Design a protein around this ligand. Structure first.
Ligand SMILES: NC(=O)c1cccc(C#CCN(CC[C@H](N)C(=O)O)C[C@H]2C[C@@H](n3ccc4c(Cl)ncnc43)[C@H](O)[C@@H]2O)c1
Length: 267
């Protein structure tokens, strides 16, 4: 492990490194076990959930179709969203990630245990419903599980979908875009899936060059707030609000300088 995986020739992890070398269950155990010891991962997850709750429940971001871009094997980013969107389409470049996701959607006994995150989210929303009822709401809402490639003009290929009310992407674009032009390219590609006036919700690391799953290192585009804001505006969106938090992952997992969350509207 001298360099990030799949980065020898280009200097940045290639797309295909995720098909074969990204271990979804290892990723879930390292990042989303959500213990009670206030670890950096747990505090960050807590903050991600509160913003998602605030975005989809308090700010009333709602619609028919939400497309989740770069889901990986996680569902935490959909728990509040399924209260406000009739249909959820989850996408990722890695089929192994989608299969790990699909284990939970099918409620396989071997699926990852999300219940501490489910419990946290139910509490946020005022315990109007219990854990199982919440999980069934999400499972019902997820209609399709598709392959996506943000570097493509048609990120979902030929798959037919109506214009979406919201595109959501958490912790994805930094890892998927090897340079700033590709980053702007991807945001423009993502907008092709969105109605005019539709919502773009991005949450990602700030000034991060890599992240770790065990001894596996993966590349990350280190972007500061100003670059993100410029790229989003240039790609044809108007920013509704932009938040930056200084809380960082432990260096054994990422060298990030906090995270950002933003809500934009397609022009
Ligand atoms: N940058 C950081 O510092 C930092 C900090 C913390 C965690 C992480 C992390 C991660 C792993 N994941 C799951 C994120 C999940 N959404 C969550 O929120 O946990 C990222 C996605 C990207 C996705 N990918 C790759 C190429 C690609 C294309 Cl071309 N088109 C669409 N997707 C693509 C790849 O498959 C993988 O699944 C990074």
């Amino acid at each position: 492990g001298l360099v990030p995986r799949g980065s020898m020739e280009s200097g940045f992890t290639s797309k295909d490194t995720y098909l074969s070398h990204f271990n979804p269950r290892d990723y879930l155990e390292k990042y989303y076990k959500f213990g009670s010891r206030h670890s950096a991962e747990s505090q960050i997850l807590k903050h991600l959930l509160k913003n998602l709750f605030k975005i989809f429940c308090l700010d009333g971001v709602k619609g028919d179709l939400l497309i989740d871009i770069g889901s990986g094997p996680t569902i935490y980013q959909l728990l509040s969203a399924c209260e406000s969107f009739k249909e959820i389409v989850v996408t990722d470049y890695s089929d192994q990630n989608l299969q790990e996701l699909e284990k939970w959607l099918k409620a396989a006994p071997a699926a990852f245990d999300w219940s501490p995150v489910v419990t946290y989210v139910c509490d946020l929303e005022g315990n109007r419903v219990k854990g199982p009822e919440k999980e069934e709401k999400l499972r019902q809402a997820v209609k399709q599980v598709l392959k996506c490639d943000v570097t493509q003009s048609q990120p979902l290929g030929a798959v037919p979908l109506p214009p979406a009310d919201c595109v959501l992407s958490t912790l994805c674009l930094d890892a998927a875009c090897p340079d700033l032009p590709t980053y702007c390219r991807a945001l423009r590609n993502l907008g092709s899936l969105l109605k005019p006036g539709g919502f773009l919700v991005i949450m990602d690391a700030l000034k991060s060059s890599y992240y770790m799953i065990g001894e596996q290192k993966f590349s990350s585009l280190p972007l500061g707030r100003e670059a993100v804001e410029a790229a989003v505006k240039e790609a044809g969106y108007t920013i509704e609000w932009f938040e930056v938090i200084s809380q960082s992952y432990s260096s054994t997992m990422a060298n990030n300088e906090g995270l950002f969350s933003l809500v934009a509207r397609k022009l």
